[PDB]
């Protein structure tokens, strides 16, 4: 993925908390990230719409 994120990366989300990227799909504005958030389960985020900070 050319989206800025990497498989295995730890990220922080304002609502979902700290998590780890466990899969990615797509490219360009369509890039999406599957994130396992410690206490909030697994979620798909569209990279271009999600505020994530690299822990």
């Amino acid at each position: 993925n050319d989206s800025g994120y990497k498989l295995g990366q730890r990220v922080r989300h304002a609502k979902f908390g700290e998590g780890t990227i466990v899969n990615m799909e797509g490219s360009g504005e369509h890039s999406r990230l599957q994130v396992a958030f410690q206490g909030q389960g697994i979620k798909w985020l569209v990279a271009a719409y999600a505020r994530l900070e690299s822990v």
Partner: protein
């Protein structure tokens, strides 16, 4: 065999059910064959260079179409709106043809069709004349509809629902509570607008361009661990390189004539439009519009 495109069937003589399985085949003067074919469940498959079949949507993913864009190619859309705490539907009255109302089709105080009656061409005419373009529907009617696009919770970036997911009351609730008051779904039926491409996506194991290219590459080159360049170049060289592929002028003329195109001249290699147009004609044939060669 001669160059061109050919639409055929098995004359219902393969499976016990006697179901007629339709197919399409592109044969070049030189280069790899490209085949499309239905299975008994009405899913669509592609065969490249006469090898084992793959869910047909893989070739479109390899040509840079998203799930949403694939659905855009093969289906018209039915739009629902949420307003006044009611579910409304954008109406194209002609789409009601042949159906029996499951609820009162009413607008502007007037009831056009009763919950029991069969919808008439007269009903449709009056609806068109009165410019009825929006009608209230029961929430239950949203169930089973297929969402045509990705919907995101914009406050978090979370994907709320992916293109091609089946709608439910629970999902409708989530969408509504996320601020999405307009929802696009597929126009399909079980008769002459079949959901073949939508169901094909559900058995397609790939989810983007790179995974599609890798699926193709692994199929063509067993024993060769795939690299980016290798998968890209192999695909480009199947149908899109003059060095390795040529329909020939005769082939192009016959190809274009089968698709009812005006032009007789054209390229020795294939375009995205060539491939999509062949898929669309095969789907027409299955839907009862037009016939095999």
């Amino acid at each position: 065999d001669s160059p061109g495109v050919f639409f055929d069937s098995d004359k219902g003589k393969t499976h016990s059910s006697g179901k007629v399985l339709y197919n399409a085949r592109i044969i070049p003067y030189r280069g790899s064959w490209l085949d499309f074919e239905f299975d008994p469940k009405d899913n669509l498959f592609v065969r490249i260079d006469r090898r084992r079949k793959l869910p047909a949507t893989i070739i479109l993913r390899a040509l840079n179409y998203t799930t949403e864009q694939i659905l855009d190619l093969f289906f018209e859309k039915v739009i629902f709106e949420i307003r006044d705490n009611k579910l409304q539907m954008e109406l194209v009255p002609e789409r009601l043809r042949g159906e029996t109302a499951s609820f009162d089709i009413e607008a502007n105080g007037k009831v056009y069709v009763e919950k029991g009656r069969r919808i008439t061409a007269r009903h449709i005419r009056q609806l068109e004349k009165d410019d009825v373009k929006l009608i209230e529907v029961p929430v239950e009617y949203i169930a089973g509809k297929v969402v045509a696009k990705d919907y995101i919770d914009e406050s978090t970036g979370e994907l709320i629902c992916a293109a091609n997911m089946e709608l439910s009351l629970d999902l409708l609730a989530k969408l509504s509570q996320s601020g999405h008051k307009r929802i696009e779904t597929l126009f399909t039926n079980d008769l002459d607008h079949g959901p073949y491409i939508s169901e094909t996506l559900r058995v397609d194991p790939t989810n983007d361009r790179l995974s599609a290219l890798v699926e193709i590459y692994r199929m063509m080159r067993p024993g060769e661990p795939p690299t980016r360049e290798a998968a890209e170049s192999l695909f480009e060289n199947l149908f899109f390189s003059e060095d390795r592929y040529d329909l020939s002028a005769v082939g192009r003329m016959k190809f274009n004539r089968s698709l009812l195109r005006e032009e007789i001249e054209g390229s020795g290699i294939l375009s995205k439009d060539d491939i999509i147009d062949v898929m669309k004609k095969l789907i027409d044939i299955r839907n009862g519009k037009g016939e095999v060669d």
